[PDB]
Design a protein around this ligand. Structure first.
Ligand SMILES: O=C1C[C@@](O)(C(=O)O)C[C@@H](O)[C@@H]1O
Ligand SMILES: O=C1C[C@@](O)(C(=O)O)C[C@@H](O)[C@@H]1O
Ligand SMILES: O=C1C[C@@](O)(C(=O)O)C[C@@H](O)[C@@H]1O
Ligand SMILES: O=C1C[C@@](O)(C(=O)O)C[C@@H](O)[C@@H]1O
Ligand code: NA
Ligand code: NA
Ligand code: NA
Ligand code: NA
Lengths: 145, 145, 145, 145
């Protein structure tokens, strides 16, 4: 696969978690849309989610070996805490775009700091699931001239 | 005047200052691409660029009187300094999206704080001129099924 | 085990992240040097690396049951984030030396704080693979005066 | 002399208390072991201690003129206070390794900052007088493979 989409802890709860009090679409719905999008552009796209930081790190390591050209990542809570993730992405030297569903700057102060943002191509926050689709459009044109 | 795109100070310089390496597109090129994208969606797109904070504030007050529905703003340097912009946008209560061409997290520490971001629907940084198109796509869709 | 060497996350990448820039020294090379150094002093050494913080915590717990007398630990990114590792090492009451390959004080400011160093016998950083060998040297002489 | 060993203020006291901070050995003894270690490897080593910052700076200047290839420095209290010393080592551009006998990160907060460490090849702390012997072992391999 040429692009890997990674989703961090708790994002498996989307739609499952508090629907109509705080839900509606799901991770599996987001994943299908992105694969379809990338399928329209003749590009293979993988996806991965985990609540375990080591699984994600491991997955990033595997990406180097598969020749993934770009990672689109929603590190979720790990954004704020995990230097291990940062050093995984820099260690494999695969460029990445960071995406958040919610506008992190409108939330608690600890959510305003990222161990990844300075090393990303760019960041999109607050635009919901559409944030991933934008990141993918960007990535497609970065690979195909 | 359904959608207003505002460009802050110095953005008039795009694709001027030595065009050998990296990026060559001008503010004018960005504007035409946005207007053509808005035409396709049947939305009327207004654009404005100034180096003067008060002109930007005045244009935003004018947006309310014109019944603008949403603002896409690249406040450029004013993002870090201007409470007056924040107040104009809240005072007219037009929702906005914030866009930066560059990844501000990779730059000096003063560039990490925004008097706007916490009130924005969301923020796109570091995806170049494509960020404004993404913001527009999201804004279009926010008005229209 | 008498002495246990622990490598934290991402140290599996050594020698594969970009050989012209970074070099060809691998984690296996390190481990072989250490094992031989300890074989020479009539010392048994085990090694462990993982990208998963809980595997490293459980490995530390196991060292207490195996009768390990000292740990040499390169916590990698977990030096900056993991209270759990600190709590493990304290909980089992095995002395440790902390080793970093890179000079951490020359890098980002977050790399300068640690949850471990204040409980270590000592710290070595910046001396590449040889920092481990110096720690093992100190460790061999402590257990066998 | 190809390698110069610098000891900062107070380190002439090393016999007496506080010993529990490493150690019972005296300076003359430390410098006798390092001279021998350097003999067995055919390197010419000098040593220097003073309680006066200007004398250390003078000494580093002369090191330039005498053709010194590497410095091993325990700056003692000067680590936390002397920018003159930093500027001296950088000015004569001789590479250096920083050593402390005690684990500074286990001591008062002011002792955790160094005006030298970011420019050092590396740092050893907390291993007693053996940290000097390590520093010289690395230094010997750096100048003679
Ligand atoms: O879990 C998440 C999700 C998030 O990254 C987002 O997608 O909005 C925002 C993070 O702060 C939070 O920890
Ligand atoms: O002027 C600008 C441009 C900018 O908003 C951008 O578009 O990247 C980023 C701001 O920090 C800077 O002051
Ligand atoms: O992951 C690592 C590796 C490291 O521990 C080293 O061995 O140089 C230093 C840490 O700052 C970093 O987060
Ligand atoms: O004098 C010393 C000795 C020391 O550098 C050491 O060798 O542990 C630690 C310093 O903070 C203290 O000022
Ligand atoms: Na953001
Ligand atoms: Na941003
Ligand atoms: Na250190
Ligand atoms: Na230290």
């Amino acid at each position: 696969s040429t692009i890997l989409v990674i989703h961090g802890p708790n994002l498996n709860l989307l739609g499952k978690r508090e629907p109509e009090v705080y839900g509606h679409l799901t991770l599996d719905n987001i994943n299908r849309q992105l694969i379809a999008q990338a399928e329209q552009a003749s590009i293979t796209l993988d996806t991965f989610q985990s609540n375990w930081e080591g699984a994600i790190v491991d997955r990033i390591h595997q990406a180097q070996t598969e020749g993934v050209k770009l990672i689109i990542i929603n590190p979720a809570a790990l954004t704020h805490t995990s230097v291990a993730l940062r050093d995984a992405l820099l260690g494999v030297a695969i460029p990445f775009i960071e995406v958040h569903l919610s506008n992190v700057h409108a939330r608690e102060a600890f959510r305003h700091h990222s161990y990844l943002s300075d090393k990303a191509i760019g960041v999109i926050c607050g635009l919901g699931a559409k944030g991933y689709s934008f990141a993918l459009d960007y990535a497609i044109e970065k690979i195909q001239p």
